[PDB]
Design a protein around this motif. Structure first.
Motif, mmCIF file in Angstrom:
data_model
loop_
_atom_site.group_PDB
_atom_site.id
_atom_site.type_symbol
_atom_site.label_atom_id
_atom_site.label_comp_id
_atom_site.label_asym_id
_atom_site.label_seq_id
_atom_site.Cartn_x
_atom_site.Cartn_y
_atom_site.Cartn_z
ATOM 1 N N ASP B 4 -25.982 5.928 -33.494
ATOM 2 C CA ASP B 4 -26.361 6.830 -34.582
ATOM 3 C C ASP B 4 -25.905 6.275 -35.925
ATOM 4 N N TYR B 5 -24.789 5.545 -35.910
ATOM 5 C CA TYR B 5 -24.279 4.894 -37.115
ATOM 6 C C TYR B 5 -25.169 3.737 -37.528
ATOM 7 N N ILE B 6 -25.485 2.884 -36.565
ATOM 8 C CA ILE B 6 -26.381 1.776 -36.837
ATOM 9 C C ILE B 6 -27.697 2.303 -37.406
ATOM 10 N N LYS B 7 -28.228 3.353 -36.780
ATOM 11 C CA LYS B 7 -29.460 3.992 -37.237
ATOM 12 C C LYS B 7 -29.329 4.505 -38.673
ATOM 13 N N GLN B 8 -28.234 5.211 -38.935
ATOM 14 C CA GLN B 8 -27.963 5.789 -40.244
ATOM 15 C C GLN B 8 -27.819 4.714 -41.317
ATOM 16 N N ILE B 9 -27.017 3.697 -41.010
ATOM 17 C CA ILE B 9 -26.858 2.565 -41.910
ATOM 18 C C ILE B 9 -28.229 1.949 -42.181
ATOM 19 N N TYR B 10 -29.029 1.796 -41.127
ATOM 20 C CA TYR B 10 -30.367 1.210 -41.240
ATOM 21 C C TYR B 10 -31.270 2.034 -42.176
ATOM 22 N N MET B 11 -31.177 3.348 -42.039
ATOM 23 C CA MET B 11 -32.019 4.253 -42.807
ATOM 24 C C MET B 11 -31.646 4.189 -44.279
ATOM 25 N N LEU B 12 -30.348 4.145 -44.567
ATOM 26 C CA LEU B 12 -29.872 4.070 -45.949
ATOM 27 C C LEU B 12 -30.354 2.804 -46.645
ATOM 28 N N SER B 22 -19.436 5.634 -48.086
ATOM 29 C CA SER B 22 -19.529 7.005 -48.563
ATOM 30 C C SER B 22 -20.961 7.543 -48.435
ATOM 31 N N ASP B 23 -21.927 6.634 -48.472
ATOM 32 C CA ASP B 23 -23.319 6.989 -48.273
ATOM 33 C C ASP B 23 -23.473 7.462 -46.848
ATOM 34 N N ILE B 24 -22.710 6.823 -45.962
ATOM 35 C CA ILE B 24 -22.815 7.028 -44.523
ATOM 36 C C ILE B 24 -22.127 8.313 -44.120
ATOM 37 N N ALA B 25 -21.016 8.603 -44.796
ATOM 38 C CA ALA B 25 -20.196 9.770 -44.506
ATOM 39 C C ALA B 25 -20.927 11.027 -44.945
ATOM 40 N N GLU B 26 -21.617 10.932 -46.080
ATOM 41 C CA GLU B 26 -22.421 12.046 -46.558
ATOM 42 C C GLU B 26 -23.664 12.211 -45.696
ATOM 43 N N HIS B 31 -16.244 12.741 -41.685
ATOM 44 C CA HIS B 31 -15.174 12.332 -42.590
ATOM 45 C C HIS B 31 -15.214 10.821 -42.830
ATOM 46 N N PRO B 32 -14.944 10.390 -44.076
ATOM 47 C CA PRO B 32 -14.954 8.971 -44.456
ATOM 48 C C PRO B 32 -14.135 8.095 -43.503
ATOM 49 N N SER B 33 -13.021 8.640 -43.022
ATOM 50 C CA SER B 33 -12.119 7.944 -42.109
ATOM 51 C C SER B 33 -12.782 7.656 -40.764
ATOM 52 N N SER B 34 -13.625 8.579 -40.313
ATOM 53 C CA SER B 34 -14.405 8.378 -39.091
ATOM 54 C C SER B 34 -15.375 7.196 -39.256
ATOM 55 N N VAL B 35 -16.032 7.134 -40.414
ATOM 56 C CA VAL B 35 -16.926 6.035 -40.793
ATOM 57 C C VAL B 35 -16.221 4.683 -40.773
ATOM 58 N N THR B 36 -15.030 4.650 -41.358
ATOM 59 C CA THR B 36 -14.204 3.450 -41.431
ATOM 60 C C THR B 36 -13.783 2.928 -40.053
ATOM 61 N N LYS B 37 -13.376 3.836 -39.170
ATOM 62 C CA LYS B 37 -13.040 3.469 -37.794
ATOM 63 C C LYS B 37 -14.244 2.828 -37.091
ATOM 64 N N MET B 38 -15.427 3.417 -37.275
ATOM 65 C CA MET B 38 -16.625 2.886 -36.643
ATOM 66 C C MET B 38 -17.073 1.567 -37.271
ATOM 67 N N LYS B 41 -15.189 -1.368 -35.751
ATOM 68 C CA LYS B 41 -15.813 -1.626 -34.450
ATOM 69 C C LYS B 41 -17.138 -2.408 -34.627
ATOM 70 N N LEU B 42 -18.016 -1.904 -35.498
ATOM 71 C CA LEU B 42 -19.293 -2.573 -35.791
ATOM 72 C C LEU B 42 -19.142 -3.992 -36.366
ATOM 73 N N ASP B 43 -18.211 -4.168 -37.303
ATOM 74 C CA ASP B 43 -17.949 -5.485 -37.869
ATOM 75 C C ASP B 43 -17.405 -6.465 -36.802
#
Lengths: 130, 132
Positions: B4-12, B22-26, B31-38, B41-43
Protein backbone atom coordinates in the motif's frame (compact mmCIF):
# COMPACT_ATOMS: atom_id res chain seq x y z
CA UNK A 1 -14.88 -18.90 10.17
CA UNK A 2 -17.75 -16.40 10.57
CA UNK A 3 -21.39 -16.94 11.41
CA UNK A 4 -22.29 -17.13 7.72
CA UNK A 5 -19.53 -19.66 7.06
CA UNK A 6 -21.07 -21.83 9.79
CA UNK A 7 -24.68 -21.51 8.60
CA UNK A 8 -23.52 -22.18 5.04
CA UNK A 9 -21.50 -25.25 6.10
CA UNK A 10 -24.34 -26.53 8.31
CA UNK A 11 -26.77 -26.20 5.41
CA UNK A 12 -24.25 -27.82 3.00
CA UNK A 13 -23.99 -30.79 5.34
CA UNK A 14 -27.77 -31.11 5.69
CA UNK A 15 -28.00 -30.88 1.86
CA UNK A 16 -25.51 -33.75 1.46
CA UNK A 17 -26.36 -35.87 4.55
CA UNK A 18 -29.68 -34.81 6.10
CA UNK A 19 -27.81 -33.86 9.29
CA UNK A 20 -25.07 -31.55 10.52
CA UNK A 21 -22.85 -33.37 13.05
CA UNK A 22 -20.46 -31.31 15.22
CA UNK A 23 -17.52 -33.47 14.09
CA UNK A 24 -18.39 -32.91 10.40
CA UNK A 25 -18.77 -29.15 10.88
CA UNK A 26 -15.45 -29.01 12.74
CA UNK A 27 -13.76 -31.10 10.08
CA UNK A 28 -15.26 -29.06 7.21
CA UNK A 29 -14.27 -25.67 8.69
CA UNK A 30 -10.90 -26.94 9.96
CA UNK A 31 -11.70 -25.96 13.57
CA UNK A 32 -12.00 -27.85 16.87
CA UNK A 33 -15.32 -29.37 17.96
CA UNK A 34 -15.14 -27.17 21.10
CA UNK A 35 -15.31 -24.06 18.88
CA UNK A 36 -18.16 -25.55 16.81
CA UNK A 37 -19.99 -26.07 20.12
CA UNK A 38 -19.72 -22.43 21.15
CA UNK A 39 -20.79 -21.20 17.74
CA UNK A 40 -23.69 -23.65 17.58
CA UNK A 41 -24.91 -22.20 20.87
CA UNK A 42 -24.65 -18.63 19.54
CA UNK A 43 -26.54 -19.75 16.41
CA UNK A 44 -29.29 -21.33 18.54
CA UNK A 45 -29.63 -18.06 20.46
CA UNK A 46 -30.15 -16.49 17.04
CA UNK A 47 -32.91 -18.90 15.94
CA UNK A 48 -31.02 -20.18 12.88
CA UNK A 49 -31.05 -23.63 14.43
CA UNK A 50 -32.09 -25.53 17.53
CA UNK A 51 -29.33 -27.37 19.34
CA UNK A 52 -29.58 -30.08 22.01
CA UNK A 53 -28.83 -33.16 17.64
CA UNK A 54 -28.60 -29.90 15.70
CA UNK A 55 -31.56 -28.85 13.60
CA UNK A 56 -31.97 -25.93 11.20
CA UNK A 57 -35.09 -23.83 11.73
CA UNK A 58 -37.01 -22.27 8.85
CA UNK A 59 -34.84 -19.17 9.23
CA UNK A 60 -31.85 -21.47 9.15
CA UNK A 61 -32.93 -23.24 5.98
CA UNK A 62 -33.82 -19.99 4.23
CA UNK A 63 -30.57 -18.16 4.95
CA UNK A 64 -28.28 -21.15 4.39
CA UNK A 65 -29.76 -21.54 0.91
CA UNK A 66 -29.05 -17.87 0.06
CA UNK A 67 -25.46 -18.31 1.17
CA UNK A 68 -24.90 -21.49 -0.88
CA UNK A 69 -26.63 -19.97 -3.90
CA UNK A 70 -24.32 -16.98 -3.57
CA UNK A 71 -21.14 -19.02 -3.17
CA UNK A 72 -21.92 -21.22 -6.20
CA UNK A 73 -22.99 -18.30 -8.40
CA UNK A 74 -19.70 -16.57 -7.54
CA UNK A 75 -17.86 -19.77 -8.45
CA UNK A 76 -19.70 -19.89 -11.78
CA UNK A 77 -18.78 -16.23 -12.27
CA UNK A 78 -15.04 -16.93 -11.90
CA UNK A 79 -15.24 -20.08 -14.04
CA UNK A 80 -17.06 -18.28 -16.86
CA UNK A 81 -14.46 -15.52 -17.00
CA UNK A 82 -11.65 -18.04 -17.26
CA UNK A 83 -10.07 -18.16 -13.82
CA UNK A 84 -7.94 -21.26 -13.12
CA UNK A 85 -10.02 -23.82 -11.21
CA UNK A 86 -7.43 -24.16 -8.43
CA UNK A 87 -7.72 -20.50 -7.38
CA UNK A 88 -11.51 -20.25 -7.70
CA UNK A 89 -12.43 -21.56 -4.26
CA UNK A 90 -10.13 -19.21 -2.33
CA UNK A 91 -11.19 -16.21 -4.36
CA UNK A 92 -14.92 -16.81 -3.83
CA UNK A 93 -14.53 -17.16 -0.08
CA UNK A 94 -12.25 -14.15 0.12
CA UNK A 95 -15.01 -12.04 -1.41
CA UNK A 96 -18.39 -13.37 -0.24
CA UNK A 97 -17.26 -11.94 3.11
CA UNK A 98 -16.34 -8.56 1.60
CA UNK A 99 -18.72 -7.56 -1.26
CA UNK A 100 -22.09 -5.80 -0.77
CA UNK A 101 -25.20 -7.71 -1.82
CA UNK A 102 -25.64 -5.06 -4.52
CA UNK A 103 -22.32 -6.13 -6.04
CA UNK A 104 -23.39 -9.78 -5.83
CA UNK A 105 -26.70 -9.00 -7.57
CA UNK A 106 -24.77 -7.26 -10.36
CA UNK A 107 -22.39 -10.22 -10.69
CA UNK A 108 -25.45 -12.45 -11.02
CA UNK A 109 -26.68 -10.29 -13.89
CA UNK A 110 -23.26 -10.65 -15.50
CA UNK A 111 -23.43 -14.44 -15.31
CA UNK A 112 -26.91 -14.25 -16.85
CA UNK A 113 -25.40 -12.07 -19.64
CA UNK A 114 -22.86 -14.74 -20.53
CA UNK A 115 -25.46 -17.55 -20.32
CA UNK A 116 -27.66 -15.81 -22.90
CA UNK A 117 -25.32 -16.26 -25.89
CA UNK A 118 -22.27 -18.54 -26.29
CA UNK A 119 -20.76 -15.98 -28.64
CA UNK A 120 -20.10 -13.72 -25.65
CA UNK A 121 -17.87 -16.18 -23.80
CA UNK A 122 -16.00 -16.99 -27.04
CA UNK A 123 -15.24 -13.29 -27.56
CA UNK A 124 -14.14 -12.91 -23.97
CA UNK A 125 -11.79 -15.90 -24.26
CA UNK A 126 -10.19 -14.19 -27.26
CA UNK A 127 -9.11 -11.44 -24.90
CA UNK A 128 -7.70 -14.04 -22.50
CA UNK A 129 -5.37 -14.78 -25.43
CA UNK A 130 -3.31 -11.89 -24.06
CA UNK B 1 1.06 -2.82 3.59
CA UNK B 2 4.52 -2.46 2.09
CA UNK B 3 2.35 -2.84 -0.98
CA UNK B 4 0.00 0.00 0.00
CA UNK B 5 3.00 2.26 0.64
CA UNK B 6 4.62 1.45 -2.67
CA UNK B 7 1.25 2.11 -4.32
CA UNK B 8 0.80 5.39 -2.44
CA UNK B 9 4.33 6.57 -3.20
CA UNK B 10 3.69 5.62 -6.84
CA UNK B 11 0.45 7.59 -6.96
CA UNK B 12 2.04 10.72 -5.49
CA UNK B 13 4.80 10.66 -8.08
CA UNK B 14 2.29 10.16 -10.93
CA UNK B 15 0.27 13.02 -9.43
CA UNK B 16 2.86 15.61 -8.36
CA UNK B 17 6.10 14.35 -9.89
CA UNK B 18 7.56 13.75 -6.43
CA UNK B 19 6.89 11.92 -3.17
CA UNK B 20 7.90 13.23 0.25
CA UNK B 21 7.48 11.44 3.58
CA UNK B 22 4.91 14.01 4.68
CA UNK B 23 3.03 13.62 1.40
CA UNK B 24 2.78 9.94 2.22
CA UNK B 25 1.70 10.41 5.83
CA UNK B 26 -1.11 12.73 4.79
CA UNK B 27 -2.11 10.41 1.96
CA UNK B 28 -2.14 7.15 3.94
CA UNK B 29 -3.58 8.93 6.97
CA UNK B 30 -0.85 7.55 9.23
CA UNK B 31 1.72 9.03 11.62
CA UNK B 32 4.96 10.36 10.01
CA UNK B 33 6.95 7.96 12.21
CA UNK B 34 5.09 4.98 10.72
CA UNK B 35 6.08 6.24 7.23
CA UNK B 36 9.72 6.54 8.30
CA UNK B 37 9.83 2.98 9.67
CA UNK B 38 8.43 1.67 6.38
CA UNK B 39 10.76 3.82 4.24
CA UNK B 40 13.82 2.31 5.82
CA UNK B 41 12.46 -1.17 5.12
CA UNK B 42 11.73 -0.08 1.50
CA UNK B 43 15.15 1.56 1.07
CA UNK B 44 17.12 -1.41 2.51
CA UNK B 45 14.91 -3.75 0.52
CA UNK B 46 15.66 -1.75 -2.60
CA UNK B 47 12.10 -0.68 -3.41
CA UNK B 48 13.02 3.03 -3.30
CA UNK B 49 15.92 5.41 -2.75
CA UNK B 50 15.42 8.01 -0.07
CA UNK B 51 17.56 11.01 0.86
CA UNK B 52 16.91 13.40 3.75
CA UNK B 53 15.86 16.73 2.19
CA UNK B 54 15.19 15.01 -1.17
CA UNK B 55 12.17 12.79 -0.65
CA UNK B 56 12.29 9.52 -2.51
CA UNK B 57 12.44 7.78 -5.86
CA UNK B 58 11.17 4.25 -6.61
CA UNK B 59 13.69 1.73 -7.93
CA UNK B 60 12.81 -0.17 -11.11
CA UNK B 61 11.57 -2.82 -8.70
CA UNK B 62 9.34 -0.53 -6.63
CA UNK B 63 7.90 1.08 -9.79
CA UNK B 64 6.99 -2.38 -11.07
CA UNK B 65 5.06 -3.16 -7.89
CA UNK B 66 3.47 0.27 -7.46
CA UNK B 67 2.21 0.33 -11.05
CA UNK B 68 0.75 -3.15 -10.83
CA UNK B 69 -0.97 -2.26 -7.54
CA UNK B 70 -2.66 0.95 -8.74
CA UNK B 71 -3.76 -0.98 -11.83
CA UNK B 72 -5.43 -3.51 -9.55
CA UNK B 73 -7.26 -0.85 -7.54
CA UNK B 74 -8.35 1.20 -10.56
CA UNK B 75 -9.38 -1.92 -12.43
CA UNK B 76 -11.57 -3.12 -9.58
CA UNK B 77 -13.30 0.25 -9.44
CA UNK B 78 -13.98 0.16 -13.18
CA UNK B 79 -15.17 -3.43 -12.96
CA UNK B 80 -17.79 -2.61 -10.33
CA UNK B 81 -18.93 0.59 -12.07
CA UNK B 82 -19.12 -1.17 -15.46
CA UNK B 83 -21.38 -3.92 -14.11
CA UNK B 84 -23.60 -1.25 -12.52
CA UNK B 85 -22.88 -1.46 -8.77
CA UNK B 86 -24.28 1.57 -6.91
CA UNK B 87 -21.75 4.41 -7.11
CA UNK B 88 -21.62 4.97 -3.31
CA UNK B 89 -21.06 1.27 -2.56
CA UNK B 90 -18.03 1.03 -4.84
CA UNK B 91 -15.25 2.40 -2.61
CA UNK B 92 -16.01 0.23 0.43
CA UNK B 93 -16.37 -2.70 -1.98
CA UNK B 94 -13.00 -2.39 -3.81
CA UNK B 95 -11.15 -1.74 -0.56
CA UNK B 96 -12.59 -4.91 0.94
CA UNK B 97 -11.75 -7.27 -1.91
CA UNK B 98 -8.60 -5.84 -3.46
CA UNK B 99 -6.33 -7.73 -1.02
CA UNK B 100 -8.25 -11.00 -1.42
CA UNK B 101 -8.03 -11.96 -5.10
CA UNK B 102 -5.46 -14.04 -6.95
CA UNK B 103 -3.65 -12.06 -9.63
CA UNK B 104 -5.11 -14.70 -11.95
CA UNK B 105 -8.58 -13.35 -11.04
CA UNK B 106 -7.42 -9.75 -11.35
CA UNK B 107 -6.04 -10.59 -14.79
CA UNK B 108 -9.30 -12.11 -15.96
CA UNK B 109 -11.40 -9.29 -14.47
CA UNK B 110 -9.17 -7.09 -16.64
CA UNK B 111 -10.13 -8.92 -19.85
CA UNK B 112 -13.76 -8.70 -18.73
CA UNK B 113 -13.40 -4.94 -18.25
CA UNK B 114 -11.69 -4.71 -21.66
CA UNK B 115 -14.52 -6.77 -23.20
CA UNK B 116 -17.18 -4.19 -22.23
CA UNK B 117 -15.01 -1.22 -23.15
CA UNK B 118 -14.54 -2.59 -26.67
CA UNK B 119 -18.21 -2.30 -27.63
CA UNK B 120 -21.09 -0.07 -26.58
CA UNK B 121 -23.63 -2.77 -27.59
CA UNK B 122 -22.24 -5.16 -24.95
CA UNK B 123 -22.79 -2.54 -22.25
CA UNK B 124 -26.27 -1.97 -23.67
CA UNK B 125 -26.98 -5.72 -23.55
CA UNK B 126 -25.74 -5.99 -19.95
CA UNK B 127 -27.85 -3.05 -18.73
CA UNK B 128 -30.91 -4.60 -20.42
CA UNK B 129 -30.60 -7.55 -18.04
CA UNK B 130 -30.24 -5.33 -14.94
CA UNK B 131 -33.50 -3.54 -15.78
CA UNK B 132 -34.93 -7.09 -15.58
Amino acid sequence: PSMEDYIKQIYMLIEEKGYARVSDIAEALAVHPSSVTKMVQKLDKDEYLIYEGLVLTSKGKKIGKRLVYRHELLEQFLRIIGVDEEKIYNDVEGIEHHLSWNSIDRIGDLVQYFEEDDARKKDLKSIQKK
